[PDB]
Amino acid sequence: KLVRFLMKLSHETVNIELKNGTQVSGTIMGVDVAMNTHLRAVSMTVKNKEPVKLDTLSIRGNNIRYIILPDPLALDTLLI
Amino acid sequence: MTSVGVPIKILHEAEGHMVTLETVTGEVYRGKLSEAEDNMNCQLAETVVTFRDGRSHQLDNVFIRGNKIRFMILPDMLKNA
Amino acid sequence: KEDSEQMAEESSTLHLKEAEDYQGRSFLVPPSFTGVNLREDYVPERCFVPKKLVHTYRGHNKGVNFLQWFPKSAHLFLSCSMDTKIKLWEVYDRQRVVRTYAGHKLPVREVAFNNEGTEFLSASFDRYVKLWDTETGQVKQRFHTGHVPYCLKYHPDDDKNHMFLVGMQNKKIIQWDSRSGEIVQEYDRHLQAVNSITFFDKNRRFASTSDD
Amino acid sequence: QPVNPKPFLNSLTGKFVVCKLKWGMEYKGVLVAVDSYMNLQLAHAEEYIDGNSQGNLGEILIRCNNVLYVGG
Amino acid sequence: VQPVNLIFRYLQNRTRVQIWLYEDVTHRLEGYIIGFDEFMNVVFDEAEEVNMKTKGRNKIGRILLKGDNITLIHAAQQEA
Amino acid sequence: YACNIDFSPDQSFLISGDADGKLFIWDWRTHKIVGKWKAHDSTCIAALWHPHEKSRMITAGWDGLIKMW
Amino acid sequence: TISKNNKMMAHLNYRMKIILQDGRTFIGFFKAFDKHMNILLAECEEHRQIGEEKRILGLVLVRGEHIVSMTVDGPPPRD
Amino acid sequence: HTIYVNNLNEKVKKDELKRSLHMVFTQFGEIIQLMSFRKEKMRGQAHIVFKEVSSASNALRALQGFPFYGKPMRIQ
Amino acid sequence: VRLTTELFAERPQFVNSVNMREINLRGQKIPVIENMGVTRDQFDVIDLTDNDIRKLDNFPTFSRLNTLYLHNNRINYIAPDIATKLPNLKTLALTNNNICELGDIEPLAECKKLEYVTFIGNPITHKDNYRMYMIYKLPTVRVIDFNRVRLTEREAAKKMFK
Amino acid sequence: MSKTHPPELKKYMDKEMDLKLNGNRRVSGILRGFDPFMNMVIDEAVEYQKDGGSVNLGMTVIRGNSVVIMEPKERIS
Amino acid sequence: GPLSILTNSVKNNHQVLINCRNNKKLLGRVKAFDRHCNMVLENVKEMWTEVAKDRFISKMFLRGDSVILVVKNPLAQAE
Q1: How many whole angstroms separate alpha carbon J53 and alpha carbon J37?
Q2: Is B13 helix (H, G, I), strand (E, B) or coil?
Q3: Closest CA in chain I for residue H33
Q4: D12, containing H or E segment
Q5: CA G5 to chain centre
């Protein structure tokens, strides 16, 4: 079930897309099932704006359009 | 015993004073508040709306449905709670 | 009793204080002390287990012996007592008071609202049916009888809310108009007294049950 | 006499129906779907935009929120 | 009065009503109705769609319109 | 006795109240008896199911009080 | 920060930045948490894009659904 | 405290008349209650309600026969 | 009584017949206008009728204030900066005041958005060419002393001074 | 728990009011409708169009979730 | 149900072509299903007109509330 992946998902690096055509790249450190996303060591790339770096960021996971996942993350065991 | 409804207690304290809210159409409303619900529906009696150019209008009543809206600004008095 | 006799004995008195709240609207029809639906459907949801007593409704001097609901709602119910008084009660977790109607020398047996709801007729051992105005609290009609009335039904139609059938101790059914008070027709084919009457077609035909 | 939407959808089910999306895109497809969200699924579907035929598609999955048409 | 019972008044009287749609839509439909449910879904028949870019009408036979997508409903009048 | 038999919109289930201070319910589909509820502490003839509420009953007694369930 | 009660308490007494659906950016103090993610924002300042503009604001309550991005970075606060 | 007003100037626009009449009565006293109309029978007329008879009396005495927008209004 | 910050809270704040927001300060023995800033321009209308105000000055800068009532006061001078304090003021009523000279209207001329004025009862009404000077000096004003201005009166005022 | 009742609609029902719609359209109508779904029922209404004249709306229904903006002509007491 | 399409698409490792609400198109392999139609995409190809631009994504996660339209292409090449 998808709920297992969101709670287990931590420490890996992901790229995040937001409703305002905005792209974010950050590493995750959080343990909960409700998709609440907390980021540390973040880089930000807003549409029609220059890139900026952020030390920490927090995002409501429901607002995220889609998340890009890293190569070594064996999703198959998390999805089951 | 019961211990639930902490935002509702704060929401009750916000009643009777003046609130500011913005809509998805982009204009800003200023109004006096005295109605609340668990489903976040709210109603304002006496209201003034101001647009992002220079036009303003007065409204006697506005009803807000809690699930298809942008968020409202609550009075400062709540900080005392 | 005569009109002047029941009036001179002060058979009705006013004691309500909350007759109005914020506006001069009626208090019987709308549930003005509630935020629930003012008029309610017959089935809101699938039924659930009952729970607890709201209140004992302390106030009557004698036992309680009939129950009736208010038209198109369950917020207000009507009760008839052997104490010859009729009172209303609120059931949606409320304990407010309502005005008392009384005018019978002998116990009340049964009460029916009119289908429009602003009037109710009350049958008593004193062999009269009296017409009350719920908002006004006054009576100004009185129908006599030969024999004992055993059953009252109002007509099933809104227009014909003035016609009603009376089942007697004598075995006839007789139909009266409440505006004239006159015998419009007699039906006489049952053995013994007629106990109850039941319509099988609105404004067309009726069945009747008797000790026949 | 009136009919409820669920058997009505069943009456439309298996027939040939015209569809249009709120964004202004049109499709024609065969439909078999029952779910609490009332979603739709179409197979071997033809795409139309502004009244012009664009392409024949295969099976397509479309959410209930964006669709507002079903009739044939 | 209730919307479902009022829909019963339209279908019993064969009323022609016009329905408007929400979100990013610019179309008007004029049609007769035969449908009821507690969710106020609408079954639309003998319908005509007006294209506001050209004010042209096309004939439509028996369609279902989901109530959540529906905005206003009113008794139809000619538009040109 | 003239027990006030009741047949709510729930009429698939039959409801009645009787002088024993007990309430009995029958199923029309299988004609069986299935009901165990009680009201008051004395003999009475009064039983109504609320025609506009999903889970409330009202009862009256000769003690001079009215009770709800 | 988001939703979790224990995380909510740790982030208090710091300066927090908000960005919403309409491109405005807000910076404010906060001392409240609703588990459905409603927070009370105090001493807030807003920036507007037409040019650039700034306004001085009264105290605010914010609904998490509208929040697009939130970050925490601040010195010891003012009361 | 209710009066019927007649012989008002009909050419004054709804907003201008309402403001003008609003300005006149507030000058006489703490009176602010007015509804004005321009329909066929209603034109040139208004019904006004006063807070107190004393404020009404002072205002009434001054306005009776006073030229306003070049025309004499009447008060009852 | 004094126009302190406490007076604004204690006095009624209410919405008037034109849906504007009005504050009541009538007859409060006010000799000088002050402390209005506490309102923070939150009122659309300010009512200072029947007071003892000697001068029209000391107003804070307000932009929402559309209409100001100053009937029956004793004001006999107008500050030149009144246009800077109340630039969006459309109505200024100085009925029954003691305005005697044209020099006091020159500050009102700076109010490019002033539209409605009243001087009934002021001594200035007695002065020669009183109406024509106002019409020429105040072309933006639409109504004077609860009466209309004819187009023929507008040309006559301009022609006289030209 | 307990939740809450619908608002005191009785104080505002049966009055005549103007309604505002997205796209700067105006409607003037009398209102008399309430339901647990919080829909709206409008009657004897007239539309003021942005691209045409005006038409009268015969017994109008508005879905409660979609649109709710009201301007009344009678002052509440 | 529509999940049948999801499950069979997932089980046979086929590709699906997806188009976004405004500008972008995607081609990707899928392995996720739920009542909210949340999906996880693998071996994803992204194409959109800003000039034509192309970006490769190995693994992707798509939430089911910001929903986009899915078309299945079993004729695209498999892995």
Answers
A1: 33
A2: helix
A3: I17
A4: helix D5-12
A5: 17
